[PDB]
Amino acid sequence: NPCCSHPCQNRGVCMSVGFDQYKCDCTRTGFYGENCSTPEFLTRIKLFLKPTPNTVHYILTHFKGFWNVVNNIPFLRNAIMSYVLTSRSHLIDSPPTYNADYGYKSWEAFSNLSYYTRALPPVPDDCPTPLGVKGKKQLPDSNEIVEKLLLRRKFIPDPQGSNMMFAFFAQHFTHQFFKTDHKRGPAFTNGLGHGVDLNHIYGETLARQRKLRLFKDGKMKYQIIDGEMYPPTVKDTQAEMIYPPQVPEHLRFAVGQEVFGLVPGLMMYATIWLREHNRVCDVLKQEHPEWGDEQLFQTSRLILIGETIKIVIEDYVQHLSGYHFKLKFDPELLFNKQFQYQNRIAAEFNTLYHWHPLLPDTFQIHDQKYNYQQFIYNNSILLEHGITQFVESFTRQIAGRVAGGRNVPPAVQKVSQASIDQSRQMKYQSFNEYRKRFMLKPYESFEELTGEKEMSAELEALYGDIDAVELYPALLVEKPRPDAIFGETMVEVGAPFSLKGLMGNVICSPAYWKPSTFGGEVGFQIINTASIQSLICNNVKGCPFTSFSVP
């Protein structure tokens, strides 16, 4: 297959014509030629005026006093934020295109919501190498990659100061749209909403939602333990959860996402958001004593979806970017712009979000330590310390650096290896192919990638060719930005997927983004004043200080 070499550049569509020839479709690429390499006149101007992402990152992470003024000039802040959204979103195809089984556009790939979609098509089946033509006939042994390049020696904390509040928020929030159906294989998802629908609170199906709801005052079922609200039990809801048999029946908490029993950190956030739901129910009953249970529940869900997107943009991504520029959640920014209010979760977005180097060596709650053997599937820890102590503790505990390499804990070693194996099953193109897909310069050497001698040598010994390095491994060994948590590629690939899932939500569309959608101005204001601190303050006893960075 002539397209195995990935000849077409700049988003050109490679199509085989005959057995030994190929064609490139350069339509609206801004280029022409056999391989869509020759820039058009306009493209040539743009390409010359366009700054490198590293430049843009320098500018955004510097000149603090300037940004603090820009942030307070609504016309400027809005104009900038609006550009961030439109420009990054242009990198995602929407409606979506390829999936694991289709390197060409097809109706099966478009319409079948059980697939993750794909930003780059799969390497065709009959190719010289796994990645196409580059690399050896067989990719290196995955466990060797982990040990040599990813496995943690000594803990490397995050220079940006990310804490466990941040790490578990990342895990909790993304696991509503990262829900791969492993009975089927890594190419499939159970999250058919394909974004921020809060199914990890309310359940994926109406059947599960009905088991978790109280059907009084719009509320969700709960227990009162030690004078505080917790999730209901599997016994009381009949909502299936994943628990090893060791777990006693009373500690089997039931929440929207089957798997959130895995760690108390997840169940901490499930509890916090559950409280928030029932709190907003109380607020809306005041505003609407005439409302029934159903409308109270639905309107609370829509408000909580708003809070989530609000908090994710203005607190979580804000922290994660390190920008002095204050990011904004404002759907009105896009009303005069071209933008598709839909989304489809990309498998590559799932792959890049395996931030297990975030995880510490031990989990430190109050004046105690817990190893993974003790921490996993142990909600006894959650009831013992309470949410307040959990927030106090997780706020102060530093997370690990994700880029730079050699920082995956041994406990989740096999998870990192699984990430590589599964991407091979799905036939991911190479790391450098994905760089080009998101308009980055491909690395010319293992050293340029790592900015370093050891790993770059280990890498060359494993792969040989720089164009043979796989997507997942390279992301974790890539040279981090100065004192940053991520390298260049993580940010430039990840941000477009993220923003599209966030602003592509139906509530951001003009038909929805009205106060009447959320019960009036009071409900609407809950969205637009939401923060990670306020989430904790309204729902955690004592209103402890919190933040996604260590004090």
Ligand X SMILES: O=C(O)c1ccccc1Nc1cccc(C(F)(F)F)c1
Ligand Y SMILES: *[C@@H]1O[C@H](CO)[C@@H](O)[C@H](O)[C@H]1NC(C)=O
Ligand Z SMILES: *[C@@H]1O[C@H](CO)[C@@H](O[C@@H]2O[C@H](CO)[C@@H](O[C@H]3O[C@H](CO)[C@@H](O)[C@H](O)[C@@H]3O)[C@H](O)[C@H]2NC(C)=O)[C@H](O)[C@H]1NC(C)=O
Contacting residue, 412, 457, 506, 537, with ligand COH by CB under 6 A: 412
327 binds ligand X (CB under 6 A): yes
Instruction: Give me the residue label for tokens 């010319």.
Output: 444
Tell me if residue 182 is catalytic. no
Size of the site for ligand COH (CB under 6 A): 21
42 binds, among ligand BOG, ligand X, ligand Z, none (CB under 5 to 8 A by kind): none
Parallel, antiparallel, or unpaired: how do β-strands 31-32 and 38-39 relate?
Answer: antiparallel
380 binds, among ligand Z, ligand Y, ligand [N+], none (CB under 5 to 8 A by kind): ligand Y
Specify burial of residue 484 (Cβ count, 10 A radius: 0-12, 13-18, 19+). Answer: buried
**Minimum distance between the CB of residue 199 and ligand Z, rounded to whole angstroms?**
11
Fill in the per-residue mask, 191 to 230: x = in contact with ligand Z (CB under 6 A), - = not in contact: --------------xxx-----------------------
| Furthest C-alpha separation in the chain | 73
Nearer to ligand COH, 340 or 413 (CB): 413
Side-chain-side CA neighbours of residue 194 (13 Å): 23
Is the omega angle on the peptide bond into residue 245 within 30 degrees of 0, that is, cis? no
Cite the beta strand spans of 276-429 per DSSP E: 363-365, 368-370
529 binds, among ligand X, ligand COH, ligand BOG, none (CB under 5 to 8 A by kind): ligand BOG
287 binds, among ligand Z, ligand Y, a copy of itself, none (CB under 5 to 8 A by kind): a copy of itself
- CB 359 within 8 Å of CB 225: no
Nearest to 470 by CA among 187, 126, 123: 123
Of 115, 353, 428, 472, the active-site residue reads 353
88 binds ligand X (CB under 6 A): yes
* Residue 501 CB neighbours (<10 A): 22
526 binds, among ligand Z, ligand BOG, ligand [N+], none (CB under 5 to 8 A by kind): ligand BOG
Specify burial of residue 275 (Cβ count, 10 A radius: 0-12, 13-18, 19+). Answer: buried
Alpha helices in 397-520 (DSSP H): 413-425, 431-437, 446-450, 454-463, 471-477, 488-503
516 binds ligand Z (CB under 6 A): no
Contacting residue, 207, 227, 244, 286, with ligand [N+] by CB under 6 A: 207
17 binds ligand Z (CB under 6 A): no
Specify burial of residue 37 (Cβ count, 10 A radius: 0-12, 13-18, 19+). Answer: middle
Instruction: Give me the residue label for tokens 């006893």.
Output: 541
Side-chain-side CA neighbours of residue 286 (13 Å): 9
224, two tokens: 């009162």
Q: Is 434 annotated as a binding residue?
A: no
Continuous segment of H or E residues that includes residue 108: helix 107-111
Choices 127-135, 163-171, 312-320, 369-377 (CB under 6 A): range interacting with ligand [N+]: 369-377
- State how far the alpha carbon of 310 is from the alpha carbons of 41, 332, 387, 525, in Å: 40, 13, 22, 11
23 binds, among a copy of itself, ligand [N+], ligand Z, none (CB under 5 to 8 A by kind): a copy of itself
Q: Is 88 annotated as a binding residue?
A: yes
d(CA 199, CA 289): 27
**Minimum distance between the CB of residue 266 and ligand Y, rounded to whole angstroms?**
15
Q: Is 356 annotated as a binding residue?
A: yes
Tell me if residue 175 is catalytic. yes
239 binds, among ligand Y, ligand Z, ligand [N+], none (CB under 5 to 8 A by kind): ligand [N+]
108, two tokens: 């099966």
- CB 188 within 8 Å of CB 251: no
- Binding residues (CB under 8 A) for a copy of itself: these are 1, 13-19, 23, 25, 27-28, 93-95, 97, 102, 104-108, 110-112, 193, 197, 206, 287-291, 295, 298-299, 301-302, 305, 337-338, 340-342, 506, 509-512, 514-517, 519-520
- Binding residues (CB under 6 A) for ligand [N+]: these are 11, 13, 40-41, 159, 207-208, 211, 239-240, 371-373, 411, 483
- Binding residues (CB under 6 A) for ligand X: these are 84, 88, 317, 320-321, 327, 490-491, 494-495, 498-499
Residues serving a catalytic function are 175, 353
Binding site as annotated, residues for heme b: 356
Binding site as annotated, residues for substrate: 88, 323
